[PDB]
Amino acid sequence: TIRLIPFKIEEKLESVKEIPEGVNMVQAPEIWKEGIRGKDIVIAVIDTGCDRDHPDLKDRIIGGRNFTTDDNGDVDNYSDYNGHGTHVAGTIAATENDQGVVGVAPEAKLLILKVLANDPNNPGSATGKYEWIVNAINYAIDQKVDIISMSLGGPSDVPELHQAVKRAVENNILVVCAAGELSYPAAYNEVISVGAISLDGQIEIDVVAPGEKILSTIPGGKFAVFSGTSMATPHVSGALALIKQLSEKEFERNLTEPELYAQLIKRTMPLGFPKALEGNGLVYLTAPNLLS
Amino acid sequence: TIRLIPFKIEEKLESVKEIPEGVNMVQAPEIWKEGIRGKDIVIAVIDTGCDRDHPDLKDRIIGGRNFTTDDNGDVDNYSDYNGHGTHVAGTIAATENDQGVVGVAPEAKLLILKVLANSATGKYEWIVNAINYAIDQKVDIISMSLGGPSDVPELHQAVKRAVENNILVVCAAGLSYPAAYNEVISVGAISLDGQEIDVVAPGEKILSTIPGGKFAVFSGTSMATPHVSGALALIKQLSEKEFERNLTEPELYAQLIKRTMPLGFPKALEGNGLVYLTAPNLLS
């Protein structure tokens, strides 16, 4: 079975108005200065669902689908009964609207694919069948999204799962997963594997991103501060939305998934740790500007 | 028919003792000081052959093969009657021996695949044969400073097989093929002053080895490619060491793009910029 990567809830807040520090840290507001905010990019969020009524998210969700047995298998109900999926969605793309939080790619659009139901064996976490994740990835491809974002893992190498990940990248779709017993799909060579660092820059992944004390949206129109490895991946998927818009414009052509991957690796900051710990370093979107 | 990219012979020299300016521009000596000089990396040099007796190359050539009709098709005679192949070889990996020149990856090994006969010309069949041999010989990098006007599906397929076997394929952007294939790392050139491309590298006033133990300064687009091929040998040794595992060709391509310096030109001209091996160090 597939499990959500563990995470910790630090505090819940009724209201806020800020840019979360993780969004600042990856230099997203500096890319916004180039006119690049994720316009017309679509990210499939394969997670616990989402509160589609959150004021920071209502203008960003273009649809969704429930793959779980929750709500009797109602495909139209992708409600978030956990909180994690709404939090991830906010970090990717919370709207710039002078209220609440703002995501890395605040013009991007979200396809909400619920494959994780609350896990009675591990209260607070969530769980799903391999088939549900496989179905969600194929659905994402059929809907021609740009990026697929997951924060989950299983212990088995299921061929239909590798096949769907391979199908995605063959269609030039980026597949991002947190690296948390929970090895697949993040361990597949095709997947961009993400580790976490603290907001002060302290700790087979490709990149790291902030995962400690991450402020974002939760159901009910509220906000909460989470910590955990899975907090890093929405920063990366949101960054990829900015990178794809920016690079396809600057190169004046559609770029392949291997080229878009290289554009992410160009936009990393080494932290001084071994590569087995930081991979290529912290996603750091202005890195080539700094070099020039 | 496949052809050498046109180039200019600027100077011919009897003897020199220096690191060429192009090797310095891509910051190779700074990488050597990290203990990284290309050891155990093998580069297939697909070109006019090579002078195996040049003192700067005799210790770098692991073997070679002739696919042309030169020397009666003797597959073991990869002699360079043109000079371009020997010049390419010296930029990639000329030995550090306190004489002559030094390549980007002076401890790397070269597999000399002669596919062009006297400018110089070759059949597409010869280049594909050589690409297949490079794959069979499990090289790390394939370096081509050549081009043809025709999209030959058999050439595209051989490039795909190399990349599918995690071999880096580098080609000068002349004569559009094979550099125009998406799978190939396409290399443009700049002056030492910095005046569908993946990267650029110095191509003007490039000093390197020529047959008979001599040296020459060439200028041309194809002079950029050996800089990138030698740079990739440093990068693969460095990255597999630091990541502590074999890296795939897409990961290694990203390690190249990580080590580029944007120059301020549109990406349509410079791609990701100048190969610049210390870029992550500067960033840190």
UniProtKB/TrEMBL annotation, chain B:
Residues of the active site = D47 (charge relay system), H84 (charge relay system), S222 (charge relay system)
Q: What is its EC number?
A: 3.4.21.-
- Could you tell me which residue ranges the Peptidase S8/S53 domain spans? 38-261
Protease as a keyword of this entry, yes or no, is: yes
Q: Which UniProt keywords apply?
A: Hydrolase, Protease, Serine protease
Q: Which residues form the signal peptide?
A: none
One function term, GO molecular function aspect: serine-type endopeptidase activity
Enzyme class, first EC level, given as a word: hydrolase
Matching entries from InterPro entries are given as:
Peptidase_S8/S53_dom, Peptidase_S8/S53_dom_sf, Peptidase_S8/S53_subtilisin, Peptidase_S8_Asp-AS, Peptidase_S8_His-AS, Peptidase_S8_Ser-AS, Peptidase_S8_subtilisin-rel, Subtilisin_Carlsberg-like
What the entry lists under Pfam families is as follows: Peptidase_S8
An annotated GO BP = proteolysis
State the source organism's domain of life: Bacteria
What is the protein's name according to its record?
A: Major intracellular serine protease
Q: Which Gene3D superfamilies match?
A: Peptidase S8/S53 domain
The similarity comment for this entry is: Belongs to the peptidase S8 family.
